[PDB]
């Protein structure tokens, strides 16, 4: 199926709250954590703890201490560029995806106060800037050709190799399938209106397709889609509703299901 690896950084100036937090994920699973309070990088998944020796955690604890310091300075510089005082946020997201079809994606992005600031394009080796402050930064970063090449290599080769390594460590969790339990609920709501709800729960992975069809064909009417939500036990739940021959169609991990009303 599709899998992803991503590392986030969050920097907060003058916090109420850690000044710096970094979290890693594989798919929807936290794998690693570091903050300016613990000053230690730690596993967040037991399959990460069991497969990476103490030297991995010791080395990355040092790297994260260094990155924490640089993040603080970069945020001070951004505030000075914007003439901003008080508390502001700086975020980074790096990562890659290995798609089921075999294709790969790689991404590296920054945000200031929760909005896109700089987006790296690894195919053109350039940074897309949202405003004149981001442009000043883009010019400074793009002057270092070796760093752009290094980032392209990391996204395309290193990130994918780390992802495949973690996917194997966490295979019993990440590569399992828990099929959905699906039901259809019918209810007369406002007088003369009938609502049909197709509800699914207990599934893993969270990715699920749900739709309503009329006489074996795609509807013209509006379907309301429930969010895919964590149930708290490692599984997920979702729904789709319509108002009014109707049938609910569910696709999950290569299996199709139809519930005719």
């Amino acid at each position, epitope marked *: 199926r599709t899998h992803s690896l991503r590392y986030f950084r969050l920097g907060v100036s003058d916090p109420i709250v850690p000044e710096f937090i970094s979290v890693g994920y594989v798919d929807s699973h936290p794998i690693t954590t570091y903050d300016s309070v613990t000053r230690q990088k730690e596993p967040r998944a037991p399959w990460m703890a069991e497969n990476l020796a103490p030297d991995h955690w010791e080395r*990355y604890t*040092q790297l994260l201490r*260094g990155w924490q*310091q640089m993040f603080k300075v970069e945020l001070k510089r951004l505030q000075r560029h914007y003439n901003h005082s008080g508390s502001h946020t700086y975020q980074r997201m790096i990562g890659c995806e290995l798609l089921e079809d075999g294709s790969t994606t790689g991404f590296l992005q920054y945000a200031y106060d929760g909005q896109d600031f700089l987006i790296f394009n690894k195919d053109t080796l350039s940074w897309l800037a949202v405003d004149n402050v981001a442009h000043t930064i883009k010019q400074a970063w793009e002057a270092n050709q070796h760093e752009l090449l290094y980032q392209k*290599n990391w996204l395309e*080769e*290193e990130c994918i190799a780390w992802l495949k390594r973690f996917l194997e460590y966490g295979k019993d969790t990440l590569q399992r399938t828990e099929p959905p339990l699906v039901r259809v609920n019918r209810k007369e709501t406002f007088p003369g209106v009938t609502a049909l709800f197709c509800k699914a729960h207990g599934f893993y992975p969270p990715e699920i397709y749900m739709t309503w069809m009329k006489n074996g064909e795609e509807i013209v009417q509006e379907i309301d889609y429930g969010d895919i939500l964590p149930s708290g036990d490692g599984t997920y739940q979702a729904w789709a509703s319509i108002e009014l021959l109707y049938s609910c169609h569910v696709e999950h991990s290569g299996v199709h299901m139809v519930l005719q009303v």
Partner: antibody
Amino acid sequence: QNIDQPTEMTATEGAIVQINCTYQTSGFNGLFWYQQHAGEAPTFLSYNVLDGLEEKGRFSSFLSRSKGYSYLLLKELQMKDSASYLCAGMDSNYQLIWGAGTKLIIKP
Amino acid sequence: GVTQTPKFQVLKTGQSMTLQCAQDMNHNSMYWYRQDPGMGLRLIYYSASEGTTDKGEVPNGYNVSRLNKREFSLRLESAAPSQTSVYFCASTLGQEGQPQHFGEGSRLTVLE
């Protein structure tokens, strides 16, 4: 993890020399060359991370990622090129693995 | 650049020694290496940024202090003949492959 480069090479003044370096690293984040004259500090010469040849004056540095191979090419050799050339690979954890160096001797 | 001292030092076995290293390039990372014939540079200790240090490949018989952003000192608490070597301090802007800038080197000879 291992970096392999010849112990010593000898070439003639005015000619060309290619110093090979093979790396067997746990992941790859770049390949560096440094120059170190006798009794002096090493100084940065080059960095390669993607495939290709990068030219800087009389010196060129090549990388083949699929072969895990690099070379440092020195053209129009001068007596001042007599030095040790250090190859260093960066692994997945951004740590350098330093080669034992190639001592380059130039014949006048 | 990187300023390291002393250039030369003779020590008797058991004596203490501190090597000094400073850089005014606003670099975050600093390193102490030993260079011996027939082998690649070996990292003793490093400092990823001000406020942190960690062991390299050969930390036994040494300790370090990242005094401030500029300074990274190397100490030999009880000099041993095996510590006869050429020591190099280096610094880099960051931790991800920015070029290393080296000090002049310190030639230490430990004698009984």
